[PDB]
Amino acid sequence: MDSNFLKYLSTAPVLFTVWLSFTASFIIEANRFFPDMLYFPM
Amino acid sequence: DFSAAVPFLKRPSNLDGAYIGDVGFDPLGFSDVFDLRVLREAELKHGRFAMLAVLGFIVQELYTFPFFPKMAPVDAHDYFVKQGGGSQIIFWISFVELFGVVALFETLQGKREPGDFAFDPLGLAKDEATLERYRLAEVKHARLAMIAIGGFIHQYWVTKQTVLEQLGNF
Amino acid sequence: LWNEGKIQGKGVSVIPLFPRPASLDGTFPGDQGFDPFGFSSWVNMKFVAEAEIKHCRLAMLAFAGIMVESAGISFPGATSVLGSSKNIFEIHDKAVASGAMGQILLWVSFFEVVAGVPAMNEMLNGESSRIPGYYAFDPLGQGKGDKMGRMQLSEIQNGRLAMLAVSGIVHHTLITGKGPL
Amino acid sequence: TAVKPSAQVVWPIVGQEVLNGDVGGGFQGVQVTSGFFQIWRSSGITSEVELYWCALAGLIMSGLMIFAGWFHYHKAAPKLEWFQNAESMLNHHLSGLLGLGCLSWAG
Amino acid sequence: AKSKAVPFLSQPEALDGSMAGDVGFDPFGISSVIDIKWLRESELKHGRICMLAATGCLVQEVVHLPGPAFSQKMALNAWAAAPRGGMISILVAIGLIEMISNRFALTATDMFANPNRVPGDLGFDPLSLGANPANRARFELSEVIHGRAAMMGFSGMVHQMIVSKQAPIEQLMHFKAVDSSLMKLGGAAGNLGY
Amino acid sequence: VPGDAGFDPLTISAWLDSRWLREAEIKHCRVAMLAAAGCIAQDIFQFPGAKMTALHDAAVKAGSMGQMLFWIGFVEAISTAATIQMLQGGRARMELSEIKNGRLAMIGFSGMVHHYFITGKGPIELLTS
């Protein structure tokens, strides 16, 4: 793959948007399968 | 100056006959805009899918596996959508296409021919000369099968008969 | 014998229709220059040669076994435990249930684990320079000069014939539904 | 007059599926107020299949405009004397753009 | 200069045929991005856990520790039935093994800080079975291949335990095929939720 | 240059390319020749199992006109490439003959279609009646 396109995907806004979308995506998936977690269950 | 296929049209600048099966046919000028390597990747991939599909039709009317129900190929598309085997085939095609994306990156980087996967298990290509002859045959068969599969599916859509039964009847 | 150039030799094609491959040299026994798919170029020749001879020996034993059972020839008391039918498929299923096939499987597998795999690996690695298929088994001789040429060629050709015959015999029995002889 | 326009459905994630309210017509979704339903009825669409064909027509136009921007910056970029044709541009944007736009829409 | 594993790709750098199982397979070019020492440490670690995990699934099918808490033929049920105190004891012991065996060089910034440190060599040879130098090439190859195989096999067995709620050996011996009425893949967004 | 009787009274050639005009004239010629030969042919004989303008209307329902449009459109798309390239960048007698016969066929077909609007008859029918 092109090194300049990979250096573009390494830029701060792309990584910030991808990382916070990935972060948002596993918060969404964890709240989908295991919803209503007001507490650590113990 | 002019195209071998279309005498009155000029030969496209990017079409120099380097790719086998070239006859200068590009009136709409897609090679003046896009990379020919990518376009030959796409031509050979569409054609190989079409060739496998036309053999897919013919064999599927002639025989079907005992564990699968007997039915028409478009009905087979819908059955394997709902059954799971279509998703299997899509997954494994997608899995191979991952390394196909890597392969296309190798073509763009100059280090691979557009249709070469070095897939010669049966060693049918002996030297360069027969490889060129087979390659021209492959592109010609690929293009012919692209037109043929479109005919087989469209004829089924119009007349609800399979290709072998449509030759057999009428 | 070896008879290089006539059979088991360079420049020798059983079928001229298929061209003699450069990759297939004349050194291996019973080499008749038959390699349309050109496996010889990329395969390890020692492995495929040893595999060929082992398949041949299994097939020749298979042909003799199918012939004896199809003829109804049996060892004393064997018909009582195993299937009375002379169908090879029926006898095999009955032999599995008796445990005869399991005992044969156990010992054949044991030989392959303790002897077949070391011999194969050492031949391929280069530890003993074993000739493919050699298991040092000449109880009544017949080896030496005869083994180098005629016996090696006779074993390879008879075994190829047996492999084809056993294949034919089982599919004949399947389509017909009745055993041969 | 009874069904409320709605063209947005939310996923059930964190209790947010309460936003799929009962807009009517055996449907739950977010009520939309852009007036597209009234536009489509004015166009005579009367089918969701034709709305799929309009979505594909918009997608094809979106691809053609992003291609044209690439083409006209990187392959064939007009010179300044092309852009400084206010008479030609006005003739075409009055006659061609607005005029054939109205004529084709009236048709 | 092409790969032997994938003949139409270029042979990846940091893959020079020195390592065991170095057949030239890195299509995605992770070795060009991630140092091959870390990747071989991680490959050996995944495979060794998977070799035990594959053996674990099959052996737990055959033999059990005594008691009702260890009587789960199906392996995914043993996860829940086994005493929690002991499973967390296993987890803590694994963490201790990781800190001592890696010698407090655990991160991707300080493992292999010692130039003597070799990918996968944690100093584990209790019975000195690698004392013979000649077998080292074969053993390292056969460890890597056994590891890879066990990664593929354990992955299969888990996902076959999910599909068919059956342990792997008695799923082979009481095989019932996939009906496709249930276990459909995906579908969370096709029906728009629910 | 062929068929030059010095006949350009409105001087169209001054304000449009002579190549585009000649392409239009020759394409109109050929199409009109096929059309005029067609008009007389429909009355003279009918292909087995088968009106100047109404028959077109019947054919579009049968899809006969639609298939002809699609295939002519494909050839025409290649012809559009040819016209753009031409604009960008015995036999002599025959070129003049083709242009004159095509001009006669343009008027010929024009007459046949207006005859059809008048008497509702094909060109052979007009001669017959």
Ligand code: CLA
């Ligand atoms: C009659 C010819 C014609 C037409 C239709 C247009 C149309 C347009 N020009 Mg103009 N332009 C023309 C001639 C024409 N131009 C000439 C001669 C010059 C040179 C002086 C320019 C110089 C010029 C500049 C410098 C700019 C434009 C811009 C624009 C766009 C304005 C934004 C808008 O409302 O688009 C939305 C409306 C639409 C209808 C979108 C449709 C898009 C296509 C191109 C319209 C035509 C399609 C086709 C002809 C229709 C075939 C019908 C068929 C189905 C039967 C619009 C697409 C501006 C722009 O946005 O650049 C992109 C701009 O900066 N033009």
Ligand code: CLA
């Ligand atoms: C941020 C920009 C923006 C956005 C998101 C919208 C969003 C919307 N507009 Mg509005 N609009 C805007 C700017 C915007 N508008 C501006 C700047 C104008 C002034 C030109 C208008 C004028 C306008 C009209 C007149 C109409 C909308 C309508 C709509 C709705 C449907 C979208 C659609 O398909 O329009 C489709 C548009 C139509 C179907 C009618 C178009 C008629 C106009 C006159 C076409 C003119 C085109 C021409 C190129 C303009 C050139 C400018 C001129 C001065 C030279 C939607 C709520 C429609 C609506 O509210 O329906 C409920 C509607 O009728 N818009």
Ligand code: CLA
């Ligand atoms: C600090 C030391 C310590 C102490 C006091 C305990 C105390 C306890 N453990 Mg824990 N445990 C420890 C360390 C310790 N554990 C470590 C380091 C591990 C991880 C390897 C475990 C893993 C473990 C498991 C998995 C289980 C316990 C259980 C128990 C309880 C019942 C013990 C019993 O009945 O023993 C009498 C029984 C025996 C002595 C039987 C021993 C069985 C054989 C030897 C196991 C085979 C070993 C196997 C080969 C492991 C090799 C790997 C290892 C060398 C790393 C008891 C509370 C059990 C429990 O909670 O039950 C309620 C339980 O399920 N322990």
Ligand SMILES: CCCCCCCCCCCCCCCCCC(=O)OC[C@H](CO[C@@H]1O[C@H](CO)[C@H](O)[C@H](O)[C@H]1O)OC(=O)CCCCCCCCCCCCCCCCC
């Ligand atoms: C110092 C250590 C010494 C150890 C010595 C022992 C170990 C030596 C090595 C052993 C290696 C394994 C050998 C087998 C051991 C068990 C033997 C045994 O009885 O097994 C036990 C089982 C059979 O189990 C049988 O069960 C019957 C009742 O149902 C009987 O009554 C007996 O219980 C028993 O014989 O064996 C098998 O299932 C074999 C399956 C087939 C294996 C391959 C057969 C040969 C290859 C041809 C197959 C071609 C297939 C082509 C494709 C077909 C697709 C349908």
Ligand SMILES: CCCCCCCCCCCCCCCC(=O)OC[C@H](COP(=O)(O)OC[C@@H](O)CO)OC(=O)CCCCCCCCCCCCCCC
């Ligand atoms: C090296 C390790 C290799 C791992 C190989 C993976 C094997 C299993 C992969 C899927 C198997 C077949 C899938 C068919 C199943 C399938 O396609 O279902 C379809 C599903 C979407 O649902 P639909 O729109 O299809 O609904 C369709 C209707 O028919 C039913 O309502 O697609 C998905 O998005 C599910 C996958 C989650 C996507 C995100 C995954 C997590 C992201 C993690 C980061 C990226 C990882 C890779 C992402 C691709």
Ligand SMILES: CC1=C(C#C/C(C)=C/C=C/C(C)=C/C=C/C=C(C)/C=C/C=C(\C)C#CC2=C(C)C[C@@H](O)CC2(C)C)C(C)(C)C[C@H](O)C1
């Ligand atoms: C679903 C299913 C199976 C299947 C399947 C599969 C995978 C089928 C795959 C089918 C495929 C990939 C078909 C590809 C078609 C491409 C075509 C026809 C291109 C046309 C372009 C043309 C004519 C042109 C051109 C141009 C050129 C070059 C130059 C330009 O300047 C100008 C111009 C535009 C004129 C099967 C069937 C086996 C049965 C099974 O039970 C169910």
Ligand SMILES: CC1=C(C#C/C(C)=C/C=C/C(C)=C/C=C/C=C(C)/C=C/C=C(\C)C#CC2=C(C)C[C@@H](O)CC2(C)C)C(C)(C)C[C@H](O)C1
């Ligand atoms: C670290 C890491 C890796 C790894 C790894 C992994 C995943 C390792 C997993 C290791 C495991 C599973 C260890 C299990 C130990 C089990 C024990 C001690 C059982 C004790 C039973 C008892 C005390 C009892 C009892 C009794 C009770 C109470 C009551 C009765 O009614 C029942 C009973 C009679 C039985 C490796 C090595 C691969 C590589 C690398 O280096 C990195």
Ligand SMILES: CC1=C(C#C/C(C)=C/C=C/C(C)=C/C=C/C=C(C)/C=C/C=C(\C)C#CC2=C(C)C[C@@H](O)CC2(C)C)C(C)(C)C[C@H](O)C1
């Ligand atoms: C190094 C060291 C030593 C040591 C040691 C140790 C602990 C050695 C242990 C090594 C082990 C445990 C190796 C196990 C490998 C398992 C594999 C490859 C399984 C693959 C399964 C597959 C492919 C499958 C499958 C399947 C599928 C999915 C479908 C299923 O229905 C069924 C099926 C099962 C057929 C010691 C301690 C002696 C000292 C020495 O000084 C140094």
